[PDB]
Symmetry: C2
Subunit: 411 residues, 2 copies
Amino acid sequence: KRRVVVTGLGMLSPVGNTVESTWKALLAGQSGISLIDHFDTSAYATKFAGLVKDFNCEDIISRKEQRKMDAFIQYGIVAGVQAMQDSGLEITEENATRIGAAIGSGIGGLGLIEENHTSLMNGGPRKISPFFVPSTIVNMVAGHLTIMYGLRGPSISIATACTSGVHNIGHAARIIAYGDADVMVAGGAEKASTPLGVGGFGAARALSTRNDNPQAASRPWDKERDGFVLGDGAGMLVLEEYEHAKKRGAKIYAELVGFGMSSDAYHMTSPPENGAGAALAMANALRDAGIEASQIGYVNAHGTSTPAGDKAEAQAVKTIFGEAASRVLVSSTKSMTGHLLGAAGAVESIYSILALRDQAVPPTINLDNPDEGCDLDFVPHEARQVSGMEYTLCNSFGFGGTNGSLIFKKI
Amino acid sequence: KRRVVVTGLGMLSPVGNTVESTWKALLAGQSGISLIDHFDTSAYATKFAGLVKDFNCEDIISRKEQRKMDAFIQYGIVAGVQAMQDSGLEITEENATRIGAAIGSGIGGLGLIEENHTSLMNGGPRKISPFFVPSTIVNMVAGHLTIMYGLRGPSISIATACTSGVHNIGHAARIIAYGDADVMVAGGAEKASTPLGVGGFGAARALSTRNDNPQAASRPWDKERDGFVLGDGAGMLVLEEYEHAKKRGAKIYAELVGFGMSSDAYHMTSPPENGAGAALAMANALRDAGIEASQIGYVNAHGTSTPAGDKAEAQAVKTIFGEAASRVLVSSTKSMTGHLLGAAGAVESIYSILALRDQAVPPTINLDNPDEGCDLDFVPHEARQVSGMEYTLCNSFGFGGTNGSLIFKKI
């Protein structure tokens, strides 16, 4: 009965380039949303996003290698390095084989796809970079990391849109428990704030168009919500077997105890008004942890700031909690951070973990006027302090009706 | 101790639009490789590929839905439907919840990415289709299938390039055994025979340029090999728990008994001359099945027809087998089929399975003049007949040094 705990953290987010900075900014309710300026947004209905400010990998990635990797891959490597360093783990010859990676992305290298495609249109197959494939594909973060640290254990990449971070982390954990590994760096990286990403989600009408007030655009569960806001970044956790951790005396942020998956089987984009999909996923994670819905202090919602989306999620929370409806804390850091797509579940598992350490829960900012008959406590504007929270639940409900939920336990 | 068996098959390949047709063509050594004709290949160094001929989904997908999905998604849905039909499985209200999907792709919707990108370049963000994201992203086959059959169990998508089919199938199986599901449709779909796919792998110099003889281009382990050949298609298996299968009396093609994963941790594209990565993965699958290397009758190689690639793989086969070096049958159907990237491990798991049913092993065609000191039996030109084969091993060693191996057992 192998148990899995967390002993390493790494992150780049719209509100910070480290774990603690990011975390401090969120408990302070700071918004990471600003107007986009790396491409001309005149024709774009959405002109703002959650960008990573002053990203630097100079000391981490040789500019000779940077040319071979899209921005999402660069974000992922960096957050991966932070996670490995913070872990203290030393990779030995007898170690390698048992240490792996489960890192994905929802969309991958949009930037270098557009670049290479632009080059092919203007100058034919020759303008295409010899690094096109490996610089864009979703599995290249796990690819580069394993090589960088000589990792030789199981290596996978889950690509389930919005649910990627949660899926990757949960399977990295299943892998360990199963016996396939002792250590796994799991998470997701994303950088979809490009013309194709902004115009594409805009073509679907899934995005907020509140350009006058970008920081007020992401407003989950609010009456004036008009779509999600895009966020760039990456979240990485070092997962590891309990005894292998103790035997080495490493910090242990928390324990991963439940993981549940479900499918809506409703529509390619819309969730059921019902929230049936989400319920199942939260329910399976509880059953998996072997606890009840009442034992959960905080739920980091999917809460993307979509009319139909936030309503499905609330409905599901009421459905799985019942009485505990208002007794539980539910918040969406997407209010300050935006939607990190493939990295969303990664960064949010980290908030779910940090919340346990600090007994503090981040707010759902911008929640000026709640919805119709919501009975839930969405930690409305300021961070709430908590007393005896032992378990936290993290939710991701993505495109294609694919849902997941992670449950973390204190110490 | 939940056991997993195979009870449904589906496939589209360059040598057939059904499982049996494809399978018959391969035992007959037919090549599926032909010159590309859907785009102007004048500037292209590679002008041929393994295409799917006369693909039809008219009766399966409403042309109203086709517009919302890239060719790889259409191939995947169809092969998914075949698999579900062939399985005989009936989805009930009390059933849904326990039936899921693990389907990926290495590159996803290149075609609709190029189209949408071309539209944005010529006419701005407006020309972008509102279906851009859901029509291109890797998880949309599992997305559409779950909805189509009202599947509500765990739903994931592994995107590990060349190793996707194997990873998806192996995790679909881990999922079932774990208790998370009873039924899982697992596999991969791919359609990278586009300007971006052909020019991109061409920019890396990873592809064969033998345009005079396209059917002779894919020649694994041969002296005149000059890169892999691209193949389009999709392979889908219906995996399911042993008792749930019996209780329903369904055909049972075979049993999935081992699954191993490893990472090279060497280079982003090249495998170690060593073959260390591959060894580990085959070795873990054996250990996982609980059998020895001698108990394996056939190994469906990764064998892509790359100088460095085929050599690493042989080295690893010699390394894991030792004495059994020539006593075991190893062949690459990539010789007739080309490299299906994300679907490669899916179609090949199916060949690995069918080989057990029929006690026949498909040949490595084009193997005119083997390599230096190869001691292995690569089933050189014609299909070999076998007597008491009980286990077969399937290998995928992909970009980013991510490797996997599946072991199937008779009956």
